[PDB]
Structure 1
């Protein structure tokens, strides 16, 4: 047998309960609405309300539990509608079961927000609610990257237009062609193509691509020691100059803590004015541009 198919097991499961008709649906809807109002009234009467008479409390609690019963009965009734609807979409989505469950969520929404006084079979409203929920969940859970609904819709419209034009014309149209067809810009079309891209799988057969994936962002393995020696040389050169000049440069360019101190802060910490320090900075940088202080640093670019 090898009965490990949850699909067939679930179908066999949902085949147990019988399908219903319009008057039965009206009865169930009335029962659920009455049960909900009963629970609401009992909560209201439990808080600063009234000591519910034993018999009244009893039969209204019965009404509540029976409303829940009817809700569940209806959901069991229309599971088959869910599967029948879900069949069309499968082929471009996830596990069938996921779509079925989204359909069930749409059903509980529909049975929550159904009205019987309009005198209609429940099937249509159920259908629309189901489809809305399925499409929403499919979109939210389609790709490893998330693409919100309106952009999903324009992507689908672009795809349908391109496919029908391929069927009719026979050639793949152009970005300007799709821009004029969809009343949008060619750059927008290009962006929709770009965001339409789906990730490739690191796992493949060729071997796996993961083998040949150079780590362009990684240890350079030479610039590390290069920067170490660089810093050593800068400390040396700064020691060659005056200590005040060296400290001023270190604070100006953040060589001591990584925090770049500016003219007002350095003038404050040296007890002088920012123009004084600007003169200091200009003279020191002019001193540094003199090649004897720069022959040992020129090669570091």
Structure 2
């Protein structure tokens, strides 16, 4: 075989199933890791995660000063790494370890004096934490180390947990296969819900993990279908409404004999009737432009589609002729009227202007302009000046 679905179906066989002791003891390992974390918090998961991240932030703050002082005293001053670790281990609070390293009197010992100025203030940042967190710079590190160990325990146990029950995900996903969504998409969206179930399962309730994992995976597959199946995405609740309508119209088949009257579904369903026709008009799916056409020939639906945005040249020629005709006509009037018409309208100009807009730079404001236009249009209303343009209006 070649397809990757086979590379997955036969790969998951290497991980053995777990029941029933396996469930409980791997869950106990998970809880033991998280319980290692719980004691480390001493010195709903939503706030718990912020607490964890705050400890991590404190350790990052300390490590920043660590690496800064290290780059300053090793890269910028050439002191050996051992001479830094030996003198820095134990205090990590005061400046007592810097003056001693100066008194060492090795060649690098002089460059410490210059970085002493730059390290003193970095140390004040590091020391202040003690007055905030009520701990020494070493206890922070130790607590973080132990809690990271707890995380590692939880991680190994949870990966094993999901790997063991992977098969149930396929067992659930094979039921839904044909909904415009490929198979591996279904099994993966189900694995996501399987993980979400693992992280939110109490092994102490005594129930079998199968049920909870089943619920979560079923939800994670159905909702995922609603999300990613149709090319035009539809609100999640609308897919539920469509499925309900289809279920009712399916059940009423043997009742009405052939099919139900549309007004009935509004009765059987909770919704008034005027929305049902919209819900049915919405469900139309796109047709591939490669769909074969009549005579079962090579012609396809992507061929018979014209372009209607384009304007036929028969009309563009008329547009140009009207351009020229109005150009010759406006020149027949006066210069004042010509400018007024080419201003109120966008003729031969950047943009159209309003009444006060035109009156602004014409030295006589609104009403004057209103009197010119109505006059010029009157002067052009007359035949023997409107024939060539009158040929353009046909209704």
Fold match by TM threshold 0.5 = yes
Q: How many residues align?
A: 299
Q: Say if 1:63 and 1:260 are closer, same or farther in 2 by CA, change over 3 A.
A: same
Q: Say if 1:6 and 1:36 are closer, same or farther in 2 by CA, change over 3 A.
A: farther
The match for 1:65 is 152
The match for 1:26 is 27
Q: Say if 1:235 and 1:56 are closer, same or farther in 2 by CA, change over 3 A.
A: closer
The match for 2:324 is 232
Matches within 5 A, 1:198-237: 198-205=285-292, 206=296, 207=298, 208-237=300-329
The match for 2:341 is 249
Give me the whole-angstrom Cα distance separating, in 1, the residues matched to 2:352 and 2:146.
Answer: 77
CA shift, 1:44, in A, is 5.2
Contact 2:337 2:376 in 1 (8 A): yes
* Structure 2 runs not aligned, ≥5 long: 42-51, 62-128
Point out which structure has higher relative CO (alpha carbons under 8 A, 6+ apart).
2
| Aligned-residue CA RMSD (Å) | 2.5
Give me the whole-angstrom Cα distance separating, in 1, the residues matched to 2:351 and 2:253.
Answer: 60
TM-score (norm 2): 0.69
The match for 2:5 is 7
Contact 1:35 1:60 in 2 (8 A): yes
* Structure 1 runs not aligned, ≥5 long: none
Indicate the structure (1 or 2) with the bigger Cα radius of gyration: 2
Contact 2:34 2:154 in 1 (8 A): yes
**CA offset digits 1:191-227 (Å, max 9, x no partner):** 1111100111111223212222232332312111110
Match of 2:362 among 258, 270, 273: 270
Contact 2:33 2:152 in 1 (8 A): no
**CA offset digits 1:147-178 (Å, max 9, x no partner):** 11111111111111112222432323333233
Give me the whole-angstrom Cα distance separating, in 2, the residues matched to 1:133 and 1:257.
Answer: 60
Give me the whole-angstrom Cα distance separating, in 1, the residues matched to 2:240 and 2:349.
Answer: 52
Give me the whole-angstrom Cα distance separating, in 2, the residues matched to 1:252 and 1:36.
Answer: 77
Mean alpha-carbon deviation: is it higher for 101-110 or for 183-192?
183-192
Mean alpha-carbon deviation: is it higher for 11-20 or for 66-75?
11-20
CA shift, 1:113, in A, is 2.6
SS in 2 for 1:229: helix
Contact 1:35 1:65 in 2 (8 A): no
CA shift, 1:98, in A, is 0.5
Give me the whole-angstrom Cα distance separating, in 2, the residues matched to 1:239 and 1:53.
Answer: 89
Match of 1:43 among 42, 56, 66: 56
Q: Say if 1:239 and 1:211 are closer, same or farther in 2 by CA, change over 3 A.
A: same
